[PDB]
Structures are given as structure tokens and as C-alpha cells.
Design a protein around this ligand. Sequence first.
Ligand SMILES: CC(=O)N[C@@H]1[C@@H](O)[C@H](O[C@@H]2O[C@H](CO[C@H]3O[C@H](CO)[C@@H](O)[C@H](O)[C@@H]3O)[C@@H](O)[C@H](O[C@H]3O[C@H](CO)[C@@H](O)[C@H](O)[C@@H]3O[C@@H]3O[C@H](CO)[C@@H](O)[C@H](O)[C@H]3NC(C)=O)[C@@H]2O)[C@@H](CO)O[C@H]1O
Ligand SMILES: CC(=O)N[C@@H]1[C@@H](O)[C@H](O[C@@H]2O[C@H](CO[C@H]3O[C@H](CO)[C@@H](O)[C@H](O)[C@@H]3O)[C@@H](O)[C@H](O[C@H]3O[C@H](CO)[C@@H](O)[C@H](O)[C@@H]3O[C@@H]3O[C@H](CO)[C@@H](O)[C@H](O)[C@H]3NC(C)=O)[C@@H]2O)[C@@H](CO)O[C@H]1O
Ligand SMILES: *[C@@H]1O[C@H](CO)[C@@H](O)[C@H](O)[C@H]1NC(C)=O
Ligand SMILES: *[C@@H]1O[C@H](CO)[C@@H](O)[C@H](O)[C@H]1NC(C)=O
Lengths: 354, 323
Amino acid sequence: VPQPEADNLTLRYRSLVYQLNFDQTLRNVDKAGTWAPRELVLVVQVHNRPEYLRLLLDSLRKAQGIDNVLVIFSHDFWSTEINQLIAGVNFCPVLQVFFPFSIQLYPNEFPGSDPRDCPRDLPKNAALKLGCINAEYPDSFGHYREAKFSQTKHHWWWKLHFVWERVKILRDYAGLILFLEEDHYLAPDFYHVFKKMWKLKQQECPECDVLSLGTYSASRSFYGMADKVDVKTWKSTEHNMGLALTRNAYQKLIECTDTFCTYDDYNWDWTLQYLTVSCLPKFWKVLVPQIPRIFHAGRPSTQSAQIESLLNNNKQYMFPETLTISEVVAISPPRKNGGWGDIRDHELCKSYRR
Amino acid sequence: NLTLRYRSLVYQLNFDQTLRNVDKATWAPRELVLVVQVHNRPEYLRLLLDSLRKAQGIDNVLVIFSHDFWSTEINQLIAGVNFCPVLQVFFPFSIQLYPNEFPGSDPRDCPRDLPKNAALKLGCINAEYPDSFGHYREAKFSQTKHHWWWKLHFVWERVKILRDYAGLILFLEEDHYLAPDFYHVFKKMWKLKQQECPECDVLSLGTGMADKVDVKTWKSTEHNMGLALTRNAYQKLIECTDTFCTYDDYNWDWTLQYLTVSCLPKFWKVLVPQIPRIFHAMFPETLTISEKFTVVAISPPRKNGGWGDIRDHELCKSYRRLQ
Ligand SMILES: CC(=O)N[C@@H]1[C@@H](O)[C@H](O[C@@H]2O[C@H](CO[C@H]3O[C@H](CO)[C@@H](O)[C@H](O)[C@@H]3O)[C@@H](O)[C@H](O[C@H]3O[C@H](CO)[C@@H](O)[C@H](O)[C@@H]3O[C@@H]3O[C@H](CO)[C@@H](O)[C@H](O)[C@H]3NC(C)=O)[C@@H]2O)[C@@H](CO)O[C@H]1O
Ligand SMILES: CC(=O)N[C@@H]1[C@@H](O)[C@H](O[C@@H]2O[C@H](CO[C@H]3O[C@H](CO)[C@@H](O)[C@H](O)[C@@H]3O)[C@@H](O)[C@H](O[C@H]3O[C@H](CO)[C@@H](O)[C@H](O)[C@@H]3O[C@@H]3O[C@H](CO)[C@@H](O)[C@H](O)[C@H]3NC(C)=O)[C@@H]2O)[C@@H](CO)O[C@H]1O
Ligand SMILES: *[C@@H]1O[C@H](CO)[C@@H](O)[C@H](O)[C@H]1NC(C)=O
Ligand SMILES: *[C@@H]1O[C@H](CO)[C@@H](O)[C@H](O)[C@H]1NC(C)=O
């Protein structure tokens, strides 16, 4: 009997992440057929909240007409319960990718917590004399790097480039890709509205850059507002939930990698808000329905019952026959939030494009 | 190192045991469980997956795929299965995981057709242990018997979803094609066993008329395509582990046939339909037992060799112990 291996957990997780990102095993699809991603592709950034991921999977199972829509789950943490919940999805194409620069893969070194890093609340005069690595590079508020807060911005930018230029099933994909999170709940007609939203964009809003499936403001009655969409300037605090990008819109973002990776803000949506006023050629105008088709559920069983009660009471207003645009200038980030002053985070973020 | 990466994948996936197409938050394995031994011939695996997709009423039957070779094309074929619960386990002592060492091809192993007097002077590892025909160990011929015996113990005592499973488990291979009514007949075969053949030990999907089944003395070489065992029938096999792992025959079915005539407490009687429901590449209303052969003798099968290396003996016996 062969001598067993030394149980290195971090080496085992890297092996799973590296192999699955290369194989790219596609679920519920017979590749020997003529299936290709079309119109819409869902990309979900997953963390470690299985109670909210299950709510998202329940909304997808109750959704209508998504039997051919590819749903990509981008993971930054390997978890048996997380992989088990997604494995139960058999009603639509499912793909799993793993962020290969997660803190779980690097415990004792960047992008994790290097033992020579400066503490968070250590003053600069003490850090310079101590001699820690990033002593000369704090953020705009004198705070130093924390690995747990920088991973989300790294993952969002890596998964944006990965699904557009590293996923072989999305080669030459000329549709839209919807970006949501694990703590989101999609309406049963979110795909029905998106198909009419994109047709309404190609006919009445040629200047619309991106699409959104709704804001955080929802009315108790969907009467008269369920078939209406608004054309507004993209605000990160109001349109960070369910963002649909195009191939042309993605190329404008990847051309702004240096500006995205150096902006001192660990929030990806606040950084995109700065892109509109700086590196992007113009600010973004978003197409969003007056009634949201996506909800932020963040107890799980309590907020889920309120969403399903809101959608059931207004079941008559969903799935509208026709959408109509109803009757706005740019907006700058009011304040940098810091957390992205370490140049090591800058260089790692810039390398995703290469 | 690719082989070192595969070892890491196998250890994690055999422990996690991710169950597909099942919402664990009220499904439990019942009646029948399918266990398929997969190697590295996707052209035949696709035929088996086409037969499963065309089968009737197997939406609740768990199909476990035991792999001895990691392949992107192989893993992609099974991921497309969305119509029944799917589980993937990996044989952790395969040649892909150990290329340059046992159970693979150790660089110090003796050649196949090297005489024993030359092997003793050369000093190769297994020089003192050739098979019954003067031939030495070949890794490619020992993997099938190693995988079959490990997979028998793993699905019965190491799969958490099959804990306290009080049903039957069907064992087939990647090069098999199931009839669309194989599960329809099995459900009536087990009902027909509980009513007209209390002495039937195991069931078979084939070796006449479409509604007739026969009761014969169980020969392993005649029922190696789609073999359904019970927990009591499984326990009889593991109690004969030393005889299975030391018998000089790399074929698992020839070894099981020798197990019946030399180690089993009593002979087995098998229920098999006259028309096979499995093929090596309908839907009757009622099944009726036709031919009922009495228990007759069975001669010791001629050994084919290929299982004389004691290293294969110890590894085969250790599967029940390793944890
Ligand atoms: C409606 C509106 O415009 N609200 C603004 C409000 O969001 C700002 O608060 C800051 O929010 C960001 C992240 O915002 C995301 O999440 C919100 C949740 O509601 C969303 O609404 C929003 O769309 C975004 O998705 C936080 O990161 C900021 O936190 C930092 O600053 C606060 C100050 O109280 C501090 O308490 C936090 O601990 C954090 O401080 C930073 O922490 C990191 C890591 O520990 C350090 O590296 C970094 O140096 C710290 N910086 C500072 C300055 O201490 C806010 O909560 C609000 C402020 O801009 O404006 C409202 O208008
Ligand atoms: C129609 C019929 O029933 N034919 C039987 C015939 O197949 C048997 O021959 C041996 O079959 C086994 C495998 O048996 C399985 O597959 C059969 C179909 O091919 C099924 O019919 C059967 O039910 C089983 O499912 C083979 O492994 C044997 O191959 C060995 O022996 C032959 C002949 O001597 C030799 O040419 C082969 O090369 C092989 O020899 C061994 O090879 C290994 C690996 O290199 C060596 O380690 C070992 O030392 C070699 N031993 C010998 C003796 O050379 C046969 O093909 C037949 C049994 O004799 O019964 C017929 O009824
Ligand atoms: C485990 O693996 C990681 C990365 O492969 C390595 O840095 C670490 O030293 C290993 N731990 C050991 C060998 O104990
Ligand atoms: C990987 O390591 C194994 C030993 O564990 C060794 O036999 C094999 O040759 C290595 N792979 C390569 C490509 O050398």
C-alpha cells in the first residue's frame, strides 16, 4: 500500500481551484449538441453564506424561461455545503469558477496576512520605525492593509475578466452578462423583463450603457409601475444590484484597469462610480424598471417570506406584455473609503488582464 | 506535478461526496442504487449515459460513478446528467495516481516474460512472486480487480448518503448499455422474488420471452453484466476477502465464481430474465418465473493468472481496513 500524502489543506484547495478553473466542467449541458450561451448569462459572486445562497437558488428554480441561461458561480472560498447547494441545481446550465488568489489559498503571505505587514491602527511614525513592509503605503486615512477587506474587490475584477476572456464556453459571446451576489433574490419574471428591456434599449435608448434589474426601493402594489422603466444616470448606491454589462461595456472597463486598481476604495461599486467620472469616456446611463426584479435579502427565512409574499400579492402585474420608458446628469464619488492604498493590491489587480 | 494534483483532488472529492440534482434540505436512496465502474473510454460511457437518459422511471435512482482515471471529457459527460441523483467517487489507488510506483509500474519491477532464474540475479522487486504461469505483474491488468473490490466496500460502508441503506445496489461497467425498462423489470423482479423465490439470493439483468425470468445457480461469469446484490449478499463477499484477494486471477468475475465453490457457506440462486436488459457494447405488465433449475455442482474454474503478486494481495485486503 502506497505511503499516504502529508495532509496539506492549503495545497489541496489550490489543486481544486487550479484544476476546476482549467477543466471548466459544465453542468446540465450535453456539449455534443448545439447549446451555446445566448442573450443572458448569470455570474454570481459567492462568499460563505449558504443560508442566503439557498434563497437565491430558490428564486432561480421558480424563475421562468431560464432553462437555457448559463449561471456561473464564482467562488472565493471552498465549502462542502456551498458546493452541495449548487449541485442540486439541475434546471439550468451551471458553471463553477474559483478565485485563485483568495486568502484561503494564501494564509501566511500576500494576498493573505504577511507576518511583516503593518497593523491597521498603527500610526505612520511608529510603522516607519518598526520597519513593516507596507509602512510607506497606507490608505487615504492612515489605515493599513487588511486581507479580508481587499479580497472582494480583487474577486470582482478577476471574475469580470475571467468570464469574458478565460471561459471557453463564452468565446465570442455577443450577449449580456448579469452580475449579482449570493444574497440576492431574483423575481420569477426577471428574464422576461430583461429580454424586453434590451429590446427597449435598442429602440428607444441608444445612449443606455448598462442595464439593471431594479433598485432597493419597492412598492407594496405593482399597479401601473410594473411595465415602466426609467433611464437614469448610473448610481452605485442605487444600481449595484443586478448589473448587466455588454461586450462593448466590458471592454471600456478592462481598458480602465490601472484606474480601477489604484483608486483608494476597497468597494467595487464605489470604484465603478469613480470610473464614470474619470477613466470612462462618459458617465453611465442605466435602464432600470420602476418595480425591482431583484431583491437584497441581507433571518433568511423571514426576509424570504416577505419577498415571496410581495410577489404573490402582485402576481397579476408581473410578466408584462410590453415595456414603456417613462418620463439626469453624472454623479461623482462623495468620499473615498480607503482600504485600497497598498500597492501590492494594485499590482495583483492589474495582473488579471495579463 | 499533475499526478500530485490528482491525488489532492481524489482525497477531497471522496470525502465531500457532493450529491448532484438533489436538494438535501426529503430524498433518500431507496429500492435500487446504480454503481458504475468507469475507466477511460468516453465513447462507451456516452452510450451508457444515452441508455440512462432513455430509461423510464429512474428519476429517483442514485447512479454512482466510480472512476480510476481523471479526464476532462469524462467529467463533462457525467455533469450533463440532470435527470437523476448522481454521485462521483474516485478509486484512490489507480495507475494515474501512481505512475512510477506500486500499484503502478515501479521502475524496479520484473519484466513480464523474464525467466525466474534471470529475475533473481537481476534483483527486481517481485522476482520471488510470479503468477501460476511464470509471468510477472503488469499494472494495467491488476487495476480492474483492485477497483472492483474497493468500489464494493466503499459504496456500502463509506458513502454517507447510503448509510443504513436497506435496498439493493446494481453493479455495472462503463461499456454496458441498459434497456429502457431495466428498472421497470427490476421492481417486478424483486416483487417476484419476495413472492415466488424466497431462495433467490441475487438478481441479474441478463446473461426467449420478454416476460419470463429464470432461477439458476449463480455463476459469476454468466451474470457479470448488471449484478444486483443485497446487504446480506455483500456481507458474504467481504467475509471471503482473503480468498478473493489471493486467488491467482485478475478477472473479478472468475474470482467470484471460485469464491462460490470454495469459501461461500452456501450456493447462490440468481433471478435472471430470459431476454437481457443490459448489453455489452418491453415493459411487461406482469413477470412470471419460467425455468427453475435445481442447484448443481460447479467445477473450480481454470486460473488465468495475473494475480500472483502479493503486493496486489495486501492492497486488495486493506480496502476494508483503510480509514
Ligand atoms: C446613501 C449613501 O450615499 N450612503 C453613503 C454611505 O454608504 C457611506 O458609508 C460608507 O459605505 C462604504 C461601503 O458602502 C457600500 O455598502 C453600503 C451599505 O449600505 C451600500 O449602500 C453602498 O452602496 C456600498 O455598496 C463603507 O465601506 C464605508 O465604511 C468605511 O468608513 C466608515 C465610516 O464610518 C467606517 O465606519 C468603516 O469601518 C469603513 O472605514 C474603512 O475601513 C477600512 C477597512 O477597515 C479601512 O481600510 C479604511 O481606511 C476605513 N476608512 C475610514 C474612512 O475609516 C462607509 O460606511 C457614507 C460615507 O462615505 O456616505 C453616505 O452618503
Ligand atoms: C466463449 C467462452 O466462454 N470463452 C471463454 C474464454 O473467454 C476464456 O478465456 C480467458 O478469458 C479471460 C477473461 O474472461 C472474461 O472475459 C471472457 C471473454 O473474453 C468471458 O467469456 C469470461 O466470462 C470473463 O468475463 C482472459 O483473461 C484469459 O486471457 C488469458 O489467457 C489467455 C489464454 O491462455 C491468454 O491468451 C491471455 O493472454 C491471458 O493470459 C494471461 O495474461 C495475463 C496478463 O498478461 C498474464 O498475467 C497471465 O499469466 C496469462 N495467463 C496465461 C494462462 O497465459 C482468457 O482469454 C476461457 C478460460 O480458459 O474459457 C472460455 O470458456
Ligand atoms: C502546503 O502548501 C503550501 C503551498 O503549496 C506551501 O506553501 C506550504 O509550505 C505547504 N506546507 C507544508 C509543506 O507543510
Ligand atoms: C510527481 O511526483 C511523483 C511521486 O509522488 C513522481 O513519481 C512523478 O514523476 C512526479 N511527476 C513528474 C511529472 O515528474
